[PDB]
Amino acid sequence: ISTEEQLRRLQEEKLCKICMDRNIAIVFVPCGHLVTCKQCAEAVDKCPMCYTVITFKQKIFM
Amino acid sequence: EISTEEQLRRLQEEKLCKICMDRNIAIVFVPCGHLVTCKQCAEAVDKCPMCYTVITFKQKIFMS
Numbered sequence: 286i287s288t289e290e291q292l293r294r295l296q297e298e299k300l301c302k303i304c305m306d307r308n309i310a311i312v313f314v315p316c317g318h319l320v321t322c323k324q325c326a327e328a329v330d331k332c333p334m335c336y337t338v339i340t341f342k343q344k345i346f347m
Numbered sequence: 348e349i350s351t352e353e354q355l356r357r358l359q360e361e362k363l364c365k366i367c368m369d370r371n372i373a374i375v376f377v378p379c380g381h382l383v384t385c386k387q388c389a390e391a392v393d394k395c396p397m398c399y400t401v402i403t404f405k406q407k408i409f410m411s
């Protein structure tokens with residue numbers, strides 16, 4: 286696999302799993318999944334990946 | 348940043364614990380939100396090593 290396709294794959298992994306436009310920017314407490322950008326996190330009350338009820342949406346920074 | 352190779356390396360390296368660079372970040376610090384450490388390197392800190400905010404919780408995260 287090429288450098289370019291590796292890079293594209295890693296860039297797509299960072300994308301919000303709901304809008305696929307912005308990068309992920311929120312961690313859900315308590316399940317710990319990184320799924321959404323800040324805006325798309327407003328729409329979810331359960332984690333889309335594990336359906337755990339979200340008790341806090343922590344903004345993240347790399 | 349400056350080439351496709353350096354961009355690739357950056358995205359691979361940003362997954363790794365900033366202290367040991369030997370395994371993935373696995374903790375987000377509450378309240379500051381920094382992704383800094385693997386589980387092991389998080390055991391020792393009570394303030395965030397990047398911003399020195401007091402950590403009230405160490406939340407386990409899934410990063411692959």
Ligand SMILES: [Ca+2]
Nearest residue numbers: 367368369370
């Ligand atoms: Ca090493």
Ligand SMILES: [Zn+2]
Nearest residue numbers: 301304322325
């Ligand atoms: Zn989004």
Ligand SMILES: [Zn+2]
Nearest residue numbers: 316318332335
């Ligand atoms: Zn989850």
Ligand SMILES: [Zn+2]
Nearest residue numbers: 364367385388
């Ligand atoms: Zn570490």
Ligand SMILES: [Zn+2]
Nearest residue numbers: 379381395398
């Ligand atoms: Zn911090």
